[PDB]
Structure formats: C-alpha cells, structure tokens
Ligand binder design. Sequence first.
Ligand code: FE
Ligand code: FE
Lengths: 202, 201
Amino acid sequence: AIILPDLPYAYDALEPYIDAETMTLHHDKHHATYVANANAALEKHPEIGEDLEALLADVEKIPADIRQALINNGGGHLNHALFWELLSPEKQEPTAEVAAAINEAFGSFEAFQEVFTTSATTRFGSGWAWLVVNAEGKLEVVSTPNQDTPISDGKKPILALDVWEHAYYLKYRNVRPNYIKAFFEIINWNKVAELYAEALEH
Amino acid sequence: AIILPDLPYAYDALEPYIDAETMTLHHDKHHATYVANANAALEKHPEIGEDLEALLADVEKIPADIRQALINNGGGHLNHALFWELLSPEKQEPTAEVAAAINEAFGSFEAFQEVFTTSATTRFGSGWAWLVVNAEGKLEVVSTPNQDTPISDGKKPILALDVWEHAYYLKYRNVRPNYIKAFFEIINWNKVAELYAEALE
Ligand SMILES: [Fe+3]
Ligand SMILES: [Fe+3]
C-alpha cells in the first residue's frame, strides 16, 4: 500500500515563507486524501502493482476503470511527496552541476527564474509549475493542471511548485506572485541536484 | 467596458456561513481581476461588442487570439456576478414551481442536495457546480472546470456554487463539504426562481 511519508522537517520549519497551519493541512489532510484514494484504486487492480512513477508514465496502460482516479490521486501523491523533499528549512543555492544545466537551457539563472515564475503565475486554475529533464537530457519549464505530472509526458521533474490555492491562500490569499517569490528562498537545491543527476543516469 | 457589480449586501451579510474577509477578497480582488482581464481582451476586438453571454454561448466565434482569455475572464466575470445574486443574507426556501420541478427530476429535495453535493465535492481541482435547465427544459446537475460555464454548452444555470479553494479556504480549509452544506443555508431562492422562469420562456 502507498504510505504517507512524513515531512523531512517540523511543520513550522519553513516559516516564515510557508505557515505551519498550511504545512499541517497540506500534508495531513490533502496529501493523506490522495494516498487513501490512490490505495482504493490500486486495490481493485492488484495485478498492476504499486510503482506509481512507472504506472503514470503511460496513463493509457492504466486500466480504464481506475485510470482518472489513479492519475488524480496517484499523481497527487507523487507530486506532494516530491514537493516536501524539495523544500528546505535552510537557504540554498544551485549546485554547480545544476547551475550549468540551467545556463545551458536558459542562458542565465535570472532568465530561468523569470520563465519559471511566469509559468507558475500564469497557470489558470489548479496546478503545478516544474523544471524537468527531457528525453534528451535537457531542461525545460512546464506547468500542468490539477495533479497531472510531467512523468506522464516522458519528462523527469527536478523542481516542482504547487500552485493550487490550498498551497498558499492562508498566508498569501490572492497574491500568488508573493508565494512564488517566497518559494525561491526555500528550495532544496541539493535535492534538485540529486534528482537531476538521477535523471541522467540509466 | 465591463463593470464590476457591487455586492447586493454588505461584505459581512453572509456571516457566519461565508466570512467577510473572503467576500472582500473574492469580490474586490478575484472578480475585479477577471473584469480587468476581460476588458483587456475585448479592447483588442471592439468590433465584437461586449455581450459576454452571447459571446460565451458559442466560443468558436470569439476571435482565436482572445478566445481562451475571454473564456477564462469573461466566464469568471459572468459566474461571479451570478453567484453574488444567488446568495441571500436571510433565510429563503424554494418557490413552489422550482420545488416541484426538483422533486420531479430528483425525487426529493434531499436527493437533489445529495446529487449537487456529490458534483460539488468531486469536481477535482478548480471549478463550479451547477443546477441547469438543459436544451429540453429538463433539470440537470453538472460541474465545470475553472471558469467554464454551462452557457457554452446550451444549458441555462439556475444555481451555481464556486468550488475554487479561494471561495472557501479561509473558513473551511480542506473541508469543502462543510462549505457546501453552508451554501444551502444562503441560497437566494427568489433568484433561482427568476432564472428558472426565464429558462422555460
Ligand atoms: Fe497541494
Ligand atoms: Fe471565485
């Protein structure tokens, strides 16, 4: 069964940039729901196993009677599990490997930050902004709706920002640009590096 | 230009069911932004006029360059303008013909409320739950994503509930069902009636 992972840090470890109340609800209610619902789907189809990264890579291969349920809830699990690991109680900067990759794709960190900020800001309705490795090993910024993940498009996420209103409304209310700015103070660049390196390996 | 309508009641008129801070943000920030973005789009195309209901009923006739922006922001304005009118600061009950139509269509009001509540809770992500009069003059519950409106599908709304998290999160947090229950205390049934009568015309 899919298990709800604990946060890597205290509920208040990302203050003042994300409030503890939001960390609490976000993890203990939202993410827990996704996990429950993902487990309900998977239990109908024990034959498919519980490797959600692999299952979500080709959604058409998921059995039709649980396909949207698994996309939405298995995707909600994957995305939030990743999100928590990508947040750091301590300030960081991109490691050399990642900074070089960013410059290769976007020219400069400032350009990347503009592009990713824009992606996060213009996502209409619920969704996520991502930095991903494509099948050629090169970086892209993309956003997705609801709990859709770029894994389903053959991409490997290295950075993820939740832009559902639940992720920011208690502190930031309508002002999602302030939330997006705040995120850049709490990125776990070392975790981005790990995911980047893993994406190149095979 | 599209004008932001004032609320029909004070910001705190729906308390304790909807908090004032939400009403204020929702109207003054969210709906205002939809209006501003809708005007920015229409200003590129003055020759199309500003009849958003007509424009959104057949979106394939809004120019392509502003089509999505007008769906999202034109639709955000129409949906929110309707929603403020559908809320009542004192307790109302269904009018007779609307009650009867609901019992014919749904069995009982309690079943209708269940159906509507299911639609509202299962709308995944952002969107709206609706009671509409379809092309046959028949009642249907449906949900839509984002700011999509059933008028784009030839359906006439008589009840609408915003289930974007901005509409409920400050008070209800994750518990969208408690917000939906609260809505049922604050429906303007008189408005529902007007809308229903117009749909059947
Ligand atoms: Fe979330
Ligand atoms: Fe709204």
